[PDB]
Design a protein around this ligand. Structure first.
Ligand SMILES: CCN(CC)CCNC(=O)c1c(C)[nH]c(/C=C2\C(=O)Nc3ccc(Cl)cc32)c1C
Ligand SMILES: CCN(CC)CCNC(=O)c1c(C)[nH]c(/C=C2\C(=O)Nc3ccc(Cl)cc32)c1C
Lengths: 684, 681
């Protein structure tokens, strides 16, 4: 068991003694390096530190962060533990891996008596923390005990340090920050006031920069504290027109924040009034008195608003996005939004979809009550989908008081809109490349969504968005579920895909409503060609064994171009056994085995007689599939020879010709050669 | 210009010029188009009784709505001057008219803490327990329904709350649509005194103390998180308060108290029946160094390991990181320890993290850093670029900018090493094409986005679990507008990356960077690669398009597609009939340089040569293409079985015998009709 440590937790000294002479006193638990000696000091039991020191336990023994029970004594504050441990210590200024000494830890925990003790015993008071190189290269570390004490707001400790212990007031950390900055970050107003005063009077630089390139003055304004502002403005060397990183001056902030008194005070100390359109800002705040004051001085007449270079990307939403960028709005975290019909994209079962700006990027913002189960499902699924390239990009979510804003990539059109706009783009008898692109993206999207452990549960055309560059994206995961719990619910996504296949192949002419009321067989019968029929079938009957059946369907002839289909038929028809009509051969046994129900039964009679007619000078063309493939191959090769120019005009584009005359041909060949060596002739 | 001068005049509050213009005909119901502000609206807002009088004299409607639906009446409530309200009331149809968010003059009086105005409106029929009725979008997400009481409590207007409760019969346990009462509102006010005062009042009139605010927080929990003993005692004086209520994350008031290092409040909570099996409080106190509370917890008083990482390489450490306790920096859980370190960098290093409970790589910068700003800037614009590493977000802890990125398994370097033994020595390298086409897309799209990377190298290229390749490290990136010809450096580095990847990682990138352009070209194993690299060092003119055009280059064509193209060209009628006139042969008959297929008939095996002259093949390119076509068609016929064995795989044969052939044809037919014979790109 080796449960000594255990006993020290319970602090029962009899079991400890009993088992120092029955386990190791320097035994460190592997996770964090805690020794019983470390643990003893932490809980402040003099009896246990004594007992353990009487069994040789090293008081310079380091735990994971480099902490010795000595340094931990500084935290606990008890001076008689420090006394007990000091005689087995090489340096009193030994620091853990982040540069913390027992003295700093005394300053941090506001342990006044411990601080004095360590002062008398040689503790360095202006020691900056030396940390590991990772932390150094990002300018962390270098903080003093003064800074620690100021931050924590220990008024006691600051004063002692400054006056008794010669603490350096304008000591900087690696970020370039002095104790004054640290002081102003404390949430307690009095403590902060007290500590600022002390620090200021010893000569702390008042034009330092903290986080965000903010001065102490600006920190004070953002704190909304007249008192700290006056204290700071009593110094005459302070720069009042210093700007933070975003270019805001202390005054500007003051007006913005609706701080009449502090604004006035700032103006009466030489704060320039051309750091923003202050009147406008006061006006909008309904700060009538401050308006008047600012008007009296009239310093809102010399300031040009920036002329507006941000260029929206969306064309449909461009104009409104420009307006939204232009106007003033408060932020909800990283999100700028305004709930007005001008910026509304669409209605939803909760909250609607509005244009927004998120980290200055244009976005669609889907809104939910912050309670919402649906909002939680959406955000959950989106958070798992960031790798899925055919899912609408998720920027992030911002909660306000009572509303979950989900920010998504802005797309131009819905699938429905898009199909309508592009309905005239192909003449009736021309290949629909677009349908393939759309549907392959959806297959990938849903495939990947399933791999992610999610099922959509409401696939329909309103949930499918098209971007400026014709890319298609799946959206709306408010009804999604983790399928793991109920794996056969995936089937419903696949069914909806099946309806989407038809919807898209029909270029939006049949409504999705219509298609949802149809039975599986009605949908299949509605399919214009055999490839589509076969494809949809496989989606409505996916099989319990349906891991990644979506990905296998991307190889289906539906996704083959008409050139590739023709190319495949040609390549099969160039197999030597088809050319030599070797009926015994493997290929012909795959294609024509045994012994009329196909559109290419007696195919020679259905092709124009001249072509056939002139297609016969070499024993002849018979009505086998074999011979049709041969025919396709031969025409393929010779159609463009100059002597065949009449043939060419009768036929037109050969791929189109054969598929139209023989709609089942491509599918028939695919089926016969599917899992064979001749699969090699299929498209890429 | 006239109404504009009126409006303008009212701003300056020059009453003479207003008068002048009302009689000179100017309209006082003129609304500016942006926000709907009338001179009457504007007058009230700035509190000039003289101007509201003058304008009301001239028929100016006091029920005139601006963009949010607010009437100058409602705005008077904000101004809180009673004599404006007096002046406007005799034309008002309803005193409880609200703007589009449901705000009445009375609410606005409560909101701005305007005591005198509140009284006036009370006497004149203002409804005191009016909930805001807002538009249906806002309603469907349960916003709105707030009262003047709630407004006053939130704002912490102690005056107004008191009057409302006592004088004006305000309902204390009135709820908004979220289900919040004024108590919740009250506890959100940052000023301790005001909050204390208002809570007391509200509690004594019988405000429900078991209500839910944001985050499913009770009032009790809000008080704990505020760190305010006083507000906690007030709340715990009620005995019907549920002390073991949990917020959304399942944290109890006590738990929070221990977690936050609030000894006194923790003790008080235990002494009121707060159950001690809500978390491992001792451990928590222990870690806080809260010795006394430890002791107290010991004298008074978890397993759920189900999180599975996706990364296999990083899985075990990610499990540890998930398991341990760390404080959050916003949405980021991170621990700076060697165990969780992925790699070293120019500043901060790369560590494993959890971001919204998703595993991520975290790149660290000084929050000041120009470099960290460049990275975050470029990433924020790159979210559409599928071949750029996914950007989750950035969290600042106040001294350090944490940039969180998708965690990938391997670097390009590592990946090439792991897969170096997979292919036989001379196999076609499909993998190099995939990797490089992804990079071409990534950098192409990055340029289209206005950014250039400036430090493209194999350590900046990452491979995910599913063999996808991603560009990362935008710390030295720039908006290229600033110097457009610095794009060329990305293109050059791409050129070195082409070689690096074609050489399967065997040549170091260092090595390649020290070579001159001509040495790089000479080091290239084939003509496709040579030509491609050349075009990267000597680019065209289209920034975010050249790269996309180069995806059509024969380097990216499979060996089958190359062979297919040469066959299809060689089946053009004019090549077969040897029509020297013809357009195709004119395009193929260029001064020139010595090509490896000059007198090609002499260096193709003599048996094949003879068998193929099946009765005159000349040393033209035309005739070579014809040869390729014919062999293509007949190679598998049974009578050619000896030919087949000599040749082996025909694509490989021709490219190896004639390394410049594919390139030569590409170049001759590039921008012609016969481009149609190229593979679909
Ligand atoms: C075109 C008129 N028609 C009414 C019969 C449809 C009204 N518009 C929409 O339905 C609509 C449109 C045009 N776009 C959208 C949704 C968008 C949208 O347009 N962009 C977008 C980005 C992300 C998310 Cl989640 C949702 C969207 C919606 C819901
Ligand atoms: C095998 C030792 N060798 C260096 C001595 C390589 C060790 N690892 C890496 O170099 C490395 C690895 C495994 N991953 C990364 C970088 C990653 C990384 O793995 N994910 C990731 C996300 C975003 C960004 Cl900006 C950078 C990265 C790096 C730099």
């Amino acid at each position: 068991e080796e449960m000594l440590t255990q006993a020290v937790q319970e602090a029962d000294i009899e079991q400890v003694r009993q088992l120092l002479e029955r386990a190791d006193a320097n035994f460190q638990e592997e996770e964090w390096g805690w020794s019983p000696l470390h643990s003893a000091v932490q809980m402040d039991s003099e009896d246990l530190v004594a007992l353990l020191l009487k069994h040789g336990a090293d008081p310079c023994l380091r735990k994971r962060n480099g902490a010795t029970p000595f340094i931990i004594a500084g935290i606990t504050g008890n001076v008689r533990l420090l006394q007990l441990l000091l005689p087995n210590v090489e340096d009193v200024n030994e620091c853990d891996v982040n540069g913390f000494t027992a003295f700093m830890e005394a300053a941090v925990y506001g342990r006044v008596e411990a601080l004095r003790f360590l002062y008398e015993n040689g503790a360095d008071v202006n020691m900056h923390r030396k940390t590991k190189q990772d932390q150094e290269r990002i300018r962390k570390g270098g903080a003093t005990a003064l800074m620690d004490a100021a931050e924590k707001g220990h008024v006691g400790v600051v004063t002692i340090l400054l006056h008794a212990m010669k603490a350096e007031v304008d000591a900087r950390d690696n970020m370039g920050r002095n104790a004054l900055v640290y002081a102003l970050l404390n949430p307690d107003d009095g403590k902060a006031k007290a500590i600022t005063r002390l620090l200021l009077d010893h000569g702390a630089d008042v034009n330092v920069r903290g986080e965000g390139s903010k001065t102490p003055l600006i920190l004070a304004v953002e704190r909304k504290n007249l008192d700290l502002v006056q204290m700071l403005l009593e110094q005459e060397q302070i720069e009042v027109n210093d700007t933070d990183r975003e270019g805001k001056t202390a005054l500007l902030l003051a007006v913005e924040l609706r701080l009449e008194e502090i604004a006035k005070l700032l103006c009466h100390r030489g704060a320039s009034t051309n750091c923003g359109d202050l009147v406008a800002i006061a006006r909008r705040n309904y700060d009538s008195d401050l308006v008047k004051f600012l008007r009296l001085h009239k310093a809102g007449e010399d300031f040009r608003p920036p002329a507006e270079n941000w260029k929206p990307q969306s064309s449909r939403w461009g104009e409104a996005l420009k307006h939204l960028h232009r106007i003033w709005r408060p932020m909800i975290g990283k999100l700028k939004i305004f709930i007005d019909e001008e910026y509304k994209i669409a209605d939803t079962a909760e909250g609607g979809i509005y244009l927004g700006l998120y980290e200055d990027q244009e976005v669609a913002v889907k809104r939910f009550s912050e309670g919402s189960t649906r909002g939680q499902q959406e955000v959950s699924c989106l958070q798992s989908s960031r790798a899925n390239d055919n899912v609408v990009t998720f920027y992030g979510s911002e909660s306000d008081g009572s509303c979950l804003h989900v920010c998504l990539a802005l797309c131009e059109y819905t699938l429905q809109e898009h199909l309508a706009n592009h309905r005239g783009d192909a003449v009736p008898n021309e290949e629909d490349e677009s349908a393939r692109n759309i549907l392959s993206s959806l297959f990938k999207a849903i495939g990947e969504l399933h791999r992610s452990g999610y099922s959509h549960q409401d696939l329909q055309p309103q949930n499918i968005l098209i971007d400026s560059k014709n890319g298609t994206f799946l959206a709306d995961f408010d009804k999604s579920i983790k399928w793991a719990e109920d794996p056969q619910k995936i089937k419903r996504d696949l069914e909806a895909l099946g309806l989407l296949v038809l919807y898209v192949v029909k270029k939006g002419d049949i409504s999705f409503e219509t298609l949802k009321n149809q039975s599986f067989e009605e949908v299949i019968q509605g399919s214009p060609d055999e490839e589509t029929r076969d494809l949809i079938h496989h989606l409505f009957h996916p099989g319990d064994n349906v891991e990644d059946r979506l990905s296998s369907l991307l190889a289906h002839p539906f996704f083959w171009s008409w050139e590739s289909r023709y190319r495949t038929l040609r390549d099969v028809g160039n197999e030597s056994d088809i050319k030599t009509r070797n009926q015994n051969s493997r290929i012909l046994q795959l294609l024509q085995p045994g012994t009329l129900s196909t559109s290419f039964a007696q195919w020679t009679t259905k092709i124009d007689s001249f072509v056939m007619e002139e297609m016969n000078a070499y024993n002849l063309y018979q009505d086998t599939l074999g011979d049709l493939l041969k025919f396709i191959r031969n025409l393929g090769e010779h159609i463009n020879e100059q002597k065949n120019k009449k043939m060419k005009s009768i036929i037109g584009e050969p791929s189109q010709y054969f598929q139209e005359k023989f709609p089942d041909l491509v599918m028939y060949v695919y089926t016969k050669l599917q899992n064979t060596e001749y699969m090699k002739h299929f498209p890429k």
